[PDB]
């Protein structure tokens, strides 16, 4: 129902969309594996993620990778809050742009090489303003979610239109 405070720990599922809780904590919070959750960090920042259970996670800790920590402006050992987010809708359209200093000199089709395999059949939840790192080939590029419909939260479903067009941003 309400936000629950937990201590940030390092990910064992190294994926931008996944946070891990212990099974006792998931039971306490009425969460099912695969639920969408809303995380609140510092500087008014938020993130939406998929929660999974983890038999190595301390009860009062939450595991998340560095991409999510950076989106929340937190470090390991900081405290964030987690709450269920079951009302997030499938996105009609999303608009993402690469970050200039991660695409320097990169040519080709950013959707085909990076975004399409990243989102494919994953139902990733995303928030407007998210920065996420995607590897394609052997280069890793950062993208920013510049707009979503609906806003500011949506789930990138198979039918969600993914737009990536225009200058890299700073």
């Amino acid at each position: 129902n309400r936000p629950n405070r937990l201590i940030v720990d390092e990910a064992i599922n190294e994926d931008n969309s996944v946070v891990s809780l212990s099974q006792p904590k998931m039971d306490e919070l009425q969460l099912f594996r695969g639920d969408t959750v809303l995380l609140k960090g510092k500087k008014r920042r938020e993130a939406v993620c998929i929660v999974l259970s983890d038999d190595t996670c301390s009860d009062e800790k939450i595991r998340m990778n560095r991409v999510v920590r950076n989106n929340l402006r937190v470090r390991l050992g900081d405290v964030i809050s987690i709450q269920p987010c079951p009302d997030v809708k499938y996105g009609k359209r999303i608009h993402v742009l690469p970050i200039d200093d991660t695409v320097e000199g990169i040519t080709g089709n950013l959707f085909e090489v990076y975004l399409k395999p990243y989102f494919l059949e994953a139902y990733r939840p995303i928030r407007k303003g998210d920065i996420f790192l995607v590897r394609g080939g052997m280069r890793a590029v950062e993208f920013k979610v510049v707009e979503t419909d609906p806003s500011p939260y949506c789930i990138v479903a198979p039918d969600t239109v993914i737009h990536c067009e225009g200058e890299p941003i700073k």
């Binding site: 594996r33 695969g34 998929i50 059949e121 994953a122």
Partner: peptide, 15 residues
């Protein structure tokens, strides 16, 4: 359905 989303997420992210 919410449950098809859950099935696909667990297939992709938890084996």
């Amino acid at each position: 359905s919410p449950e098809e989303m859950r099935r696909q997420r667990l297939h992709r992210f938890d084996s």
